[PDB]
Design a protein around this ligand. Sequence first.
Ligand SMILES: [Ca+2]
Ligand SMILES: [Ca+2]
Lengths: 78, 51
Amino acid sequence: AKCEPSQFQCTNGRCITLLWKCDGDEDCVDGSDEKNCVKKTCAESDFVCNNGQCVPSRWKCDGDPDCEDGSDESPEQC
Amino acid sequence: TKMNGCTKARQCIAYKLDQTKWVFNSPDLIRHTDHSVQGKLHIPFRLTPTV
Ligand SMILES: [Ca+2]
Ligand SMILES: [Ca+2]
């Protein structure tokens, strides 16, 4: 379809702006707003799990593991 | 809580219960299904005649 940004048009027909591609608000049906672009994967509210994964900081040291390397809930972190 | 049949985080939604003080109807706040007026607040600073 016709769009103004003319960037990364997903299967839903919406042109994913390069910023939108890293906006963190996944918009298209495909998780295309979080792919192949530069972004601060952790904000000031977010925790860097040891392998480079990023997740809600509240998940750190909560008694219940979350990120795929377990870094949010490894006893070494708590 | 593991959610059955799910594959993407956008397929589900969850929100906390809160009512500590009611919300001013505002274009930025989605209404609850029971949008009946829960209360009324007196708008301060009445305009009054003066010299
Ligand atoms: Ca997006
Ligand atoms: Ca955790």
